[PDB]
Scaffold this active site. Structure first.
Site, PDB file in Angstrom:
ATOM      1  N   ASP A  30       1.601 -50.002   7.786  1.00 34.94           N
ATOM      2  CA  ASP A  30       2.295 -48.726   7.592  1.00 34.94           C
ATOM      3  C   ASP A  30       3.634 -48.980   6.921  1.00 34.94           C
ATOM      4  OD1 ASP A  30       2.858 -45.944   7.886  1.00 34.94           O
ATOM      5  OD2 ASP A  30       3.067 -46.075  10.075  1.00 34.94           O
ATOM      6  N   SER A  31       4.252 -47.925   6.399  1.00 37.98           N
ATOM      7  CA  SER A  31       5.677 -47.977   6.102  1.00 37.98           C
ATOM      8  C   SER A  31       6.464 -47.772   7.402  1.00 37.98           C
ATOM      9  CB  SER A  31       6.074 -46.973   5.014  1.00 37.98           C
ATOM     10  OG  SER A  31       5.716 -45.653   5.365  1.00 37.98           O
ATOM     11  N   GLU A  76      15.861 -54.993  -8.343  1.00 42.30           N
ATOM     12  CA  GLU A  76      16.043 -55.794  -7.138  1.00 42.30           C
ATOM     13  C   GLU A  76      14.773 -56.453  -6.663  1.00 42.30           C
ATOM     14  OE1 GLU A  76      18.567 -56.758  -5.673  1.00 42.30           O
ATOM     15  OE2 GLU A  76      20.171 -55.253  -5.521  1.00 42.30           O
ATOM     16  N   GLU A  80      19.220 -57.393 -11.826  1.00 40.75           N
ATOM     17  CA  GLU A  80      19.724 -56.154 -11.262  1.00 40.75           C
ATOM     18  C   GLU A  80      20.529 -55.323 -12.246  1.00 40.75           C
ATOM     19  OE1 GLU A  80      20.501 -59.235 -10.044  1.00 40.75           O
ATOM     20  OE2 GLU A  80      19.854 -59.293  -7.932  1.00 40.75           O
ATOM     21  N   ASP A 122      10.696 -32.679   1.659  1.00 41.12           N
ATOM     22  CA  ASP A 122      11.536 -33.860   1.806  1.00 41.12           C
ATOM     23  C   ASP A 122      11.604 -34.630   0.489  1.00 41.12           C
ATOM     24  OD1 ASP A 122      13.146 -35.840   2.867  1.00 41.12           O
ATOM     25  OD2 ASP A 122      11.561 -36.744   4.091  1.00 41.12           O
ATOM     26  N   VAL A 167      20.906 -61.124  -2.535  1.00 47.47           N
ATOM     27  CA  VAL A 167      21.243 -62.178  -3.497  1.00 47.47           C
ATOM     28  C   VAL A 167      21.210 -61.585  -4.897  1.00 47.47           C
ATOM     29  CG1 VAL A 167      20.554 -64.451  -4.419  1.00 47.47           C
ATOM     30  CG2 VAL A 167      20.191 -63.925  -2.026  1.00 47.47           C
ATOM     31  N   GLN A 215      10.914 -47.535   9.209  1.00 47.97           N
ATOM     32  CA  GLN A 215      12.341 -47.276   9.006  1.00 47.97           C
ATOM     33  C   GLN A 215      12.900 -48.180   7.906  1.00 47.97           C
ATOM     34  OE1 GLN A 215      11.076 -46.973  12.331  1.00 47.97           O
ATOM     35  NE2 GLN A 215      11.512 -44.775  12.221  1.00 47.97           N
ATOM     36  N   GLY A 216      13.667 -47.593   6.988  1.00 53.96           N
ATOM     37  CA  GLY A 216      14.237 -48.328   5.864  1.00 53.96           C
ATOM     38  C   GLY A 216      13.399 -48.252   4.597  1.00 53.96           C
ATOM     39  N   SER A 233      12.072 -45.300   3.868  1.00 55.83           N
ATOM     40  CA  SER A 233      12.398 -43.910   3.540  1.00 55.83           C
ATOM     41  C   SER A 233      12.768 -43.723   2.097  1.00 55.83           C
ATOM     42  CB  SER A 233      13.617 -43.463   4.350  1.00 55.83           C
ATOM     43  OG  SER A 233      13.304 -43.296   5.704  1.00 55.83           O
ATOM     44  N   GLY A 234      12.162 -42.732   1.454  1.00 57.06           N
ATOM     45  CA  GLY A 234      12.519 -42.394   0.090  1.00 57.06           C
ATOM     46  C   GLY A 234      11.773 -43.164  -0.976  1.00 57.06           C
ATOM     47  N   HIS A 284      15.865 -36.657   3.195  1.00 61.55           N
ATOM     48  CA  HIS A 284      16.478 -37.209   4.395  1.00 61.55           C
ATOM     49  C   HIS A 284      17.311 -38.473   4.098  1.00 61.55           C
ATOM     50  CE1 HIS A 284      12.849 -39.856   5.074  1.00 61.55           C
ATOM     51  NE2 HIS A 284      13.761 -40.637   5.627  1.00 61.55           N
TER      52      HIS A 284
HETATM   53  C1  LIG Z   1      11.693 -42.992   8.641  1.00 60.47           C
HETATM   54  C2  LIG Z   1      10.210 -43.361   8.760  1.00 60.47           C
HETATM   55  C3  LIG Z   1       9.508 -43.106   9.939  1.00 60.47           C
HETATM   56  C4  LIG Z   1       8.153 -43.445  10.035  1.00 60.47           C
HETATM   57  C5  LIG Z   1       7.485 -44.045   8.957  1.00 60.47           C
HETATM   58  C6  LIG Z   1       6.018 -44.395   9.093  1.00 60.47           C
HETATM   59  N1  LIG Z   1       5.517 -44.729  10.256  1.00 60.47           N
HETATM   60  N2  LIG Z   1       5.318 -44.345   8.025  1.00 60.47           N
HETATM   61  C7  LIG Z   1       8.191 -44.299   7.775  1.00 60.47           C
HETATM   62  C8  LIG Z   1       9.539 -43.960   7.687  1.00 60.47           C
HETATM   63  F1  LIG Z   1      10.196 -44.213   6.565  1.00 60.47           F
HETATM   64 CA   LIG Z   2      19.268 -58.907  -5.714  1.00 61.97          CA
END
Ligand SMILES: Cc1ccc(C(=N)N)cc1F
Ligand SMILES: [Ca+2]
Length: 223
Positions: free
Chosen positions: A171-172, A52, A62, A84, A57, A174-175, A177-178, A40
């Site tokens: 939790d993880s 990084e 890097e 995914d 900065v 948005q951002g 991801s991956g 995704h």
């Molecule tokens: C895109 C995304 C949505 C939900 C979670 C999460 N709640 N772990 C993590 C994510 F990277």
């Molecule tokens: Ca940097």
């Protein structure tokens, strides 16, 4: 990452930032030429940023290397997020050192209860929005299949696992991801999805990397 901690500069040496004018996803360096991320996260015009800490900065460790090719898993379904996973090849090999290092692929799948490290530059708030400059970290256990399926009826495939805390708060997000889920020094998961972030009974869902080791190895061997 919600409810995590500041990792410390270059303490997660396999963590990469994918940049297309701005950070948009994490990934994991698996050898000098290849990064694993989420399908995704696919887009064209990716620059891989290794070494990084503060992504705003230039701090001196890097390496910025453009992608030559991306390979989304042949069976990725963007509606269900099944499979995914994506591979990204670097135009030139990264220089490997203490601060830029590959992470081992798993030899076997990790069990519920296994402690893992999840990391990224994603949102640090569960209600509202704040994006960090430096890399954030979270220690989290893998959850049982039964509990994962109970949390997300009808959505958990054999290529997914849950990790985190059913109580919420950590939790993880948005951002992230991956990015990596590393357990006992092996890449077991990729940040994939969840409903909101850090919500009660809505843990993070992660791509089950151990199911993809054969595909990863044979893809690398021929590309
Ligand atoms: C895109 C995304 C949505 C939900 C979670 C999460 N709640 N772990 C993590 C994510 F990277
Ligand atoms: Ca940097």
């Amino acid at each position: 990452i919600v409810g995590g901690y500041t990792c410390g500069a270059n303490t997660v040496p396999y963590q990469v930032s994918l940049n297309s004018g701005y950070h948009f996803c994490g990934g994991s360096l698996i050898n000098s030429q290849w990064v694993v991320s989420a399908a995704h996260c696919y887009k064209s015009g990716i620059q891989v940023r290794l070494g990084e800490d503060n992504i705003n900065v230039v701090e001196g460790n890097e390496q910025f290397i453009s992608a030559s090719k991306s390979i989304v898993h042949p069976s990725y379904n963007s509606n269900t997020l099944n499979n995914d996973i994506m591979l990204i090849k670097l135009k030139s090999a990264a220089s490997l050192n203490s601060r830029v290092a590959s992470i081992s692929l798993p030899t076997s799948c990790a069990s519920a209860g296994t402690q893992c490290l999840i990391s990224g530059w994603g949102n640090t708030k569960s209600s509202g929005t704040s994006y960090p400059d430096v890399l954030k970290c979270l220690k989290a256990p893998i959850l049982s299949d039964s509990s994962c399926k109970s949390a997300y009826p009808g959505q958990i495939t054999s290529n997914m696992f849950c990790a985190g805390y059913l109580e919420g708060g950590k939790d993880s997000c948005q951002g992230d991801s991956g990015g990596p889920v590393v357990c006992s020094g092996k890449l077991q998961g990729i940040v994939s999805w969840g409903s909101g972030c850090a919500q009660k009974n809505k843990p993070g869902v992660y791509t089950k990397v151990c199911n993809y080791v054969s595909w990863i190895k044979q893809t690398i061997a021929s590309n």
